[PDB]
């Protein structure tokens, strides 16, 4: 009946096919591939889906030719800061692993050039530069290491400097062609609540900053850059105490008591900053991001089950000892239509339950031990809860306990699929899928006969949630006692997509009347031989078990006080 | 030493920010409340000797 036909779409097939073979795009994006070969490579390892990205934040991020300094040690060391203030951090660009820490400040020697301090040993082995290079558009400071010493002690702080007012270099139109130089002079603050490098707070600044006041600073630091050589330097100018505010933003000297206790052999000195430049290619030399795509190719072959088989004695008729054709049809129908959807629904049930782990969501193109073409479109998901209602039941007045009750199932219903809809992008991968409509989920409801009867109510204008459209749908059989479960299906489409939860195998059979004598007797017998079998492709179900209804519905419990303790036991 | 046709995308893109003031609201713990019961947290008003 209803129940089978909701969850498994069925699928006609002429009798000459024995299967259908399914084949589905993809589109792949891709960093570089291992070695070279003369066409290109094609299926190399670590492959990503684009559809992925829509969700996740950092799978299509890429900096490519960022004017990053790369340590040579022992050829540049003598323009880096020194390696005793702050360890070499590793860093990641491109298919490339190098270290940079710092760059350090330039006052009366040889100027730097951030060019050559960029090789890194990938640039290297496509060729020296020799023009390669020119420096983009822009120059501005990432950020700014500062060091405040107390004593032996000295604790650093980067200033995240970029976005800010005077951090741009701005062009100076004079002594070349193309000369681009900073001004960078401002007074830039330390937080009351503001961490330190490597995480943690300061241990320098405590005793002011639990006073609710902050520092100012004033920096002095000039500079010069050119876009056609990578000829530059930079200098500090100044880094002092200036002003010294209160928690409320007026102003309080610095000769005060408290104030000149707590600044009380304490000194700002500059150690060095990295520059932000991005590296003008007009005559280009990038991998970017490759794009090619893929099909696979799947196969689902059609069984045939064991016969249903009529003897009977035939020399006359009968028709109260066996009747009309309508009995196999009937054990036909059962057989089929419902016992073995059900097996097969719950077998989907328990397989979900061990290959994906209670509430925990995998990556699109996760997993070939799962049937189905649908994780390759969204996310698998599976999640299972239980509902205590005895315990979980708010009530005044007995009039309405059933209200309340059947208040809690749909708020809970609708929970589950909200979450359900927003961890596995459902809806997102649905309109990817198809564009010229851009439907809504359908919620499919499955459940036994006695349950339809608490969530079926004109109290809530919502049962399943907003925009969703929804069938409920009984079912007669004990296998199904107290459990409903939840599967997004496609309500009008009827040939398979990796979106359609369920499609019936069908093949149509008929019946064969002859006569037969084995071991010497005659009587006809009539045949049945069943054709079908249930394939499922969907990789999405939410299952919720009610228990204790009954019980929660006899007594009256729990109004639920908390007799907030003013007496003196906490 | 492989001929093939290529294109390419340079974007020139950025975000600028003016208006220095944010609010921030954080809503956590919500499906604990949506399928557990709360109410009535209520203080006994001391009468019984405590004080």
Not at 57 to 71: C, D, K, M, R
Not at 360 to 370: A, F, M, Q, R, Y
Not at 377 to 395: C, F, G, M, S
Not at 415 to 444: C, I, N, W
């Amino acid at each position: 009946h209803e129940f089978a036909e909701l969850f498994y779409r069925t699928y006609i097939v002429t009798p000459d096919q024995a299967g259908f073979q399914l084949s589905i795009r993809r589109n792949l994006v891709w960093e570089g591939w291992t070695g070279e070969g003369l066409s290109g490579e094609k299926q190399e390892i670590s492959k990503r889906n684009i559809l992925q990205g829509l969700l996740d934040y950092t799978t299509l991020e890429t900096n490519s030719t960022e004017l990053i300094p790369v340590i040579q040690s022992g050829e540049n060391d003598e323009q880096f800061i020194d390696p005793s203030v702050l360890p070499a951090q590793t860093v990641k660009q491109g298919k490339d692993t190098f270290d940079t820490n710092f760059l350090k400040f330039s006052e009366n020697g040889e100027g730097f050039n951030l060019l050559m301090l960029a090789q890194t040993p990938s640039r290297l082995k496509k060729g020296s530069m020799t023009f390669t290079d020119s420096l983009d558009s822009r120059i501005a400071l990432k950020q700014l290491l500062i060091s405040v010493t107390k004593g032996g002690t000295t604790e650093l702080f980067a200033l995240d400097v970029n976005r800010d007012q005077y951090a741009a270099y701005t062009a100076t139109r004079e002594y070349n062609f193309r000369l681009m130089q900073l001004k960078f002079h401002t007074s830039l603050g330390l937080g009351e609540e503001s961490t330190t490098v490597a995480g943690a707070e300061s241990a320098l600044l405590k005793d002011l900053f639990d006073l609710g006041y902050r520092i100012e600073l004033d920096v002095k630091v000039d500079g010069e850059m050119n876009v056609e050589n990578g000829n530059g330097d930079t200098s500090l100018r100044a880094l002092r105490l200036a002003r010294v505010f209160d928690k409320e933003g007026k102003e309080i000297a610095l000769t005060d008591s408290r104030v000149s206790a707590a600044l009380s052999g304490l000194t700002v000195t500059g150690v060095g900053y990295s520059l932000e430049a991005r590296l003008t290619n007009i005559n280009q030399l990038e991998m970017g991001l490759l794009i090619d795509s893929d099909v696979q190719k799947q196969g689902f072959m059609i069984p045939t089950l064991p016969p249903l088989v009529i003897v009977k004695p035939a020399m006359v008729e009968d028709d109260k000892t066996y009747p009309r054709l309508e009995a196999l049809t009937t054990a036909y129908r059962i057989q089929q239509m419902r016992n073995n959807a059900v097996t097969t629904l719950l077998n989907r049930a328990d397989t979900l339950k061990s290959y994906l782990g209670v509430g925990v969501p995998h990556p699109i193109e996760s997993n070939l031990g799962l049937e189905g073409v649908g994780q390759y479109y969204v996310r698998p998901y599976y999640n299972e809860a239980t509902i205590d209602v005895l315990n979980d039941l708010n009530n005044l007045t007995s009039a309405a306990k059933q209200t309340d009750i059947q208040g809690l199932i749909v708020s809970k219903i609708n929970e589950m699929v909200y979450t359900a809809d927003q961890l596995t992008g459902y809806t997102a991968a649905l309109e990817a899928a198809f564009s010229g409509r851009s439907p809504k989920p359908h919620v499919a409801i499955g459940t036994d006969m006695r349950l339809p009867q608490y969530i079926q109510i004109n109290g809530d204008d919502r049962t399943v949630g907003i925009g969703y459209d929804y069938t409920i749908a009984r079912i007669s059989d004990l296998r199904m006692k107290d459990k409903i479960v939840m599967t997004f299906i496609l309500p009008n489409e009827s040939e398979p997509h990796p979106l359609q939860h369920g499609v019936l195998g069908f093949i149509p059979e008929y019946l064969v009347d002859f006569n037969m004598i084995r071991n010497q007797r005659i009587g006809r017998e009539i045949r049945l031989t069943p054709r079908y079998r249930y394939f499922n492709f969907l990789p999405i179900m939410l299952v919720i078990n009610v228990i204790n209804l009954e019980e929660a519905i006899a007594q009256r419990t729990a109004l639920d006080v908390n007799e907030t303790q003013v007496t003196p036991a906490s």
